[PDB]
Amino acid sequence: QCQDVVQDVPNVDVQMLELYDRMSFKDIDGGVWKQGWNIKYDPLKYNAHHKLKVFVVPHSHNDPGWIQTFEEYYQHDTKHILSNALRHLHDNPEMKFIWAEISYFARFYHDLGENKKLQMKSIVKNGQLEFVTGGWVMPDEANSHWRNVLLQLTEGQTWLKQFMNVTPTASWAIDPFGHSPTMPYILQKSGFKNMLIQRTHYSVKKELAQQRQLEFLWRQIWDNKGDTALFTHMMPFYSYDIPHTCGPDPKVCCQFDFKRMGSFGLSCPWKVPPRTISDQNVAARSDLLVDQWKKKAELYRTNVLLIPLGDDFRFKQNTEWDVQRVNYERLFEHINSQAHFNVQAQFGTLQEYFDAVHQAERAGQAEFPTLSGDFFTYADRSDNYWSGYYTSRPYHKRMDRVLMHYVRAAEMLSAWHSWDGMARIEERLEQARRELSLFQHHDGITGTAKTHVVVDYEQRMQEALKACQMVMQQSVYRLLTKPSIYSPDFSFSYFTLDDSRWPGSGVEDSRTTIILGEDILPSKHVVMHNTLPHWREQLVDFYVSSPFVSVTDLANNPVEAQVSPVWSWHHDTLTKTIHPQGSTTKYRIIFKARVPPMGLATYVLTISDSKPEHTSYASNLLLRKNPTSLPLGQYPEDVKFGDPREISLRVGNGPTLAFSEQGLLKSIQLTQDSPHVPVHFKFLKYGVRSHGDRSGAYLFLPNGPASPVELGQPVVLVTKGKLESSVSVGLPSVVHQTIMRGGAPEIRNLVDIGSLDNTEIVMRLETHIDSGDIFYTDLNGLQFIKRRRLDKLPLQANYYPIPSGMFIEDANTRLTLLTGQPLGGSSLASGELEIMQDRRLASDDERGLGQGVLDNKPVLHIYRLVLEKVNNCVRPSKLHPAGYLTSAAHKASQSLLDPLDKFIFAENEWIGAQGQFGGDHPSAREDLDVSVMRRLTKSSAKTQRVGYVLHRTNLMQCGTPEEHTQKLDVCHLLPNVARCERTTLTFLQNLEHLDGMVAPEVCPMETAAYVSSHSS
Template sequence: LPQGQLSILQEKIDHLERLLAENNEIISNIRDSVINLSESVKDGQKNPEAINFSQGSVSELFPSTSVLLAVDSEDCLFASKTGGRSSGVQMLDVYDILPFDNPDGGVWKQGFDITYNENEWDSEPLQVFVVPHSHNDPGWLKTFDDYFRDQTQHILNNMVIKLQEDNRRKFIWSETSYFSKWWDGIDSQKKHAVKRLIKDGQFEIVTGGWVMPDEASSHYFALIDQMIEGHQWLEKNLGIKPKSGWAVDPFGYSPTMAYLLKRAGFSHMLIQRVHYSIKKYFSTQKTLEFFWRQNWDLGSSTDILCHMMPFYSYDIPHTCGPDPKICCQFDFKRLPGGRISCPWRVPPEAIHAGNVQHRAWLILDQYRKKSKLFRTNVLLVPLGDDFRYAESSEWDQQYQNYQKLFDYMNSRPEWHVKAQFGTLSDYFEALHKESSLSEKSSNSFFPVLSGDFFTYADRDHHYWSGYFTSRPFYKHLDRVLESYIRAAEILYSLALVQSSKSEKMSVFPSVDNYKLLTEARRNLGLFQHHDAITGTAKDWVVVDYGTRLFHSIMNLKKVIIDSAHILILKDKSAYNYDTATPFLKMDDVQASQDSLPRKTVIKLTLQPR
């Protein structure tokens, strides 16, 4: 090469060597920071007051209490053990023996004709728990915010008013994402009323995750994270911890979710969307209630009692019994003159003295037939549908007419029935008592099942499998946000400790960045909703989800930059927070929620950086 080109090449080599030296120094500083942090943690364990996060009001954002989760010894030893299957019902075996045909079952199209002897309940009355609920999708046909504005806030506002009118009324709620948004906008008097309703057992939060998540496409990290986010909010604001799982709308069910619920302290749960052939088979075997055990568990430490709803849907026509034409007549929102009616063209009738006997007997017949699919005389009857109870009139229609039916049934001792409103936990508590679950032999009363409930089909071999891969761009964006959240949480925690040991605590944006972390976790949690990550929402709703994911990724990059800045400085006193001139740059740039990221190009010149 000519002498001039050799000189230029030598200069570039020298420049690269200087850059490598700078990088080595940065890595050395990070290593020193980690070592110092480890020593700080040890000091903090010996002396909890050694690390003080009270400055900057950041402590106000943390959960008020810490939660310690015990790891069962069996969870870590299963791989080293050998043995046969420990469950009585193996779903892989069930799939092998079922023909998956679809014969016409009569009024219960996907089932069979149910008969009973009227004297069956003479010695042990039928206990009926009617559980009012409203399924609120955090985005589907409308965006999360639009649903809240148009329907959800009115449901919760009416709940506070209507439950207080009669202490026999009950109601359950699942989605903490909606509940927290509503809570932030109500006054202290209404908040006090809600806490009293919870204390009195009239109102129950079920599952309590940020959403009711999909269980096929979601990563277990996100499933846990959205549950933590919801439970921390409930503990901080309501002082409660949910104990009953409620999943009526996810499109199939994973044993992983059952395991997470069990390890979160739940003892029972409910599922609905299971293949119709499996529901029919379980109904014939009376195995709709079972202990769900992990396949790898050779003991019983992962057992959680699960209730599978037997019929087509969670709406009112498919929950009181096998005949939707009859059950629809007891959805009093469909009374003549309303906006919706029964597709079977037999409308409901308002309950009065002249028809109460006939109407009570009509629905009791459905209750009895449904109870024949289960092993106890305790019956669960959900009463609700998507975004129900948004209007004050519906609360009156449902609660007043059902109370008249209950009062009449309960006044007829020869009918041998006790019917009432209840929460999900009311039902499971009665079930525990009925089946003597407190005894050592309780597991023998209900079968033990292992396996999953995929792939779901609701009718006519319509398999819900497309959502496993639909809208792959946003499924990928979900995983990207997950990785940014974990990286940002780690760096933020390290930076918070470092800043607390120096005079830079007030300079480091701990409060602002903690809020960005919380917002990111909630946006990730929102996307685990069974109409979000699945890709089953309308296009404009998907754009709203994508925008939330994108904004959180951008915000977390800021948290990472701010945290890494203070960590790599050997002299912490040199730290200076300036939003206009960030100390570091990320390695990729994404312009919008629907664009591909581009790698940042670093141009090397002879000029110093």
């Protein structure tokens, strides 16, 4: 039944890792096609019986924020583009136009009067205006999580189905900076038949063009059968603009951009202007244009040619619509009437192009190659590799992952009930989904926008977090209060969220202290939520106003707890040291919470006069020369001091970690008997070139390999507890922390690059693992792909996105680093892993942004570090392009991305409180996730509908007995089920009516969607 994703290497015509190994990547002058060759064709190829069919496709690339904000561009440009498209298409029935960004289209359509709404629907229904992709945005493909690529796709397509009555089946991605196979994966499971891409390495375009492999069936790297395949068109030239879309010679194509004659303030840099088409020049102009088209056609296999016609924010002015349309109409009338050309040219849409290509395929005219792999890391010219944006603006990259999880938790917690309109649940969730979707844009999460635009995206995401908190806390109050007592004010705050890692300690003082006292309040209820569909334990922590606090469950059973101080790090501008201060007023309490699948668990925190029986207190040791006292108020244990030294720590039965005198990891010992395996953390810095091209928001152009950060004699703080221990050190630009709770450690870096211009800070791991030139990185949090370091390419070409994790391995040992934020990284030598923390760049890199990156702010990066023996694991063969996580590594990733949520009851007494929700939910096998749970109907619908996205990853078999778990049937999670359907991933089309109303579990590496219908 299920394909084996480990043991069968797919047979494909093009495999990108293998192609990379063989290619030479020489950057030679190809002539007018600077990165190609002088294309030749046989004029006799086309004739009366075999004509070249040419589709000229007008378009306008509209960024939802870049140099201006979304709203600034809407007011200045996009509202005029859309208004004039409506008028011009209405008045000219043969003219066509494609549109990608639904965030803008929705913003426009809601402001139109009814007369114009009807006109707009008519030009869509008749095929003149065609939506391509239909997502909220055209997202980044490097840093984005697959869950959020799906979220923004669904937001735009749901809008289109409701208001336009259409669902695109062709995708258009002309500007993201390199391309991911996560896109065809999601698109093919969302009803798509075709997709188009543009920004791939110039050497890749040349190689594929020579073999006519620019159109291909793109399947996943593990897919042996080919059921994931999606037909893909790669454009062949340097840009999507008119000079790089008519043919190989931009000096010629520029003459066919009729906006460049002067009055629009545009010109042709190749020094020959366009000229108005007339009866006296149309034969010579047609000669030149058809010659360009026939050259382009030589690179493809059918007699159907795609010619995009557009650029950024084009088709704004009425006069521009006229100048392009009238000149092209004169060319078509001539060309189409001159038999000697054997061409039929017309305005078209993207779908019309793909339909004609496949008609040719079915007529036996062409067969297409199969392809797997990705298209990172992009270079547009010379050694200019776009690996800088894997790290740029890292504060907002981390915020993306925080809001990702809060959107999932708010949608899931509120899905359990139907809500009155007055509760504003749908309103708040729509806002949250739309702001997170907007940020997936290729100038949002990428960190490539102007400073004031980054500020706009941040403000929008903060509003979205506040929306999620409101929805979550109203839902907890309803799920855990006796129904006949439940008395909501939908504007009131019953709970406040407590989040230990966002914005994080030393970033923002945002967390509330639980205030207890004999003369004010003896106790406080807290609740934990677990969005994952299996029973979960996790340590949780809260700030409390006394160290003498104990924890009980809601059966009044004692729960073991640990109290630690609250430590903050300060750059002391007097002593010129970075050192910690302990609170005299607040303390941390830590305990293990145990929470049902997709459920809630309540605990109680109670003050006492003295040390509680079931609460312990951490010891604290400050290692530094020249110490001064550190008082901690009521904290029962005195801080200890010492000169810097090496130290070792072990929590529970977990690993034993050894640290250098500078507070950095030096070894891990897995068990009592086992070796101390060398695993060393080191911080280094890259700089910028003093001559030639400069690093900026997009480009990473280092001045050689990185140099060690000079550490001096840093201050190291060691906290030792029964439940949690840690080592923290104040380094220049980074407070580095290693935390131990009995399994793989958690690493946290508080990164403040300060005023260090032209510096990139990297965290490196050095091991003696015999990895050679191989490492693995993930794609969109969905899959791990094999990388090979290539010494034939420069350092920056060997950097890849690290959206969620990376690893190196040999026959016996693996080291995996999981991340809570997307960052750039590599393995530049055998046994090494490295990941960039932040970058501050004084110069612009000449890709249109017009500024460096000088707006850095403190960010708390989070990680898990997993060292494992792998000699017993069943792994793919040497030729397989994929890799897979172990159970421990996958759970460590989930701990970063989807932790327990923590709620503190706001008032003094919670009347009607209950102890647990979800105790009867099935606890599914560990590789299965409910990625999305979303109610799809408002309260007035007679038949309620709930949508689920189910994802099964693939974990290595390494000899651990599988325990029994329960089957998860999402269609029976809510009562009174009347129907269960399998749908596309956007929920917009029903694909299968399911027997017995049971939703089957999915295969490894597959994602399915189901909708349950319920009688209400």
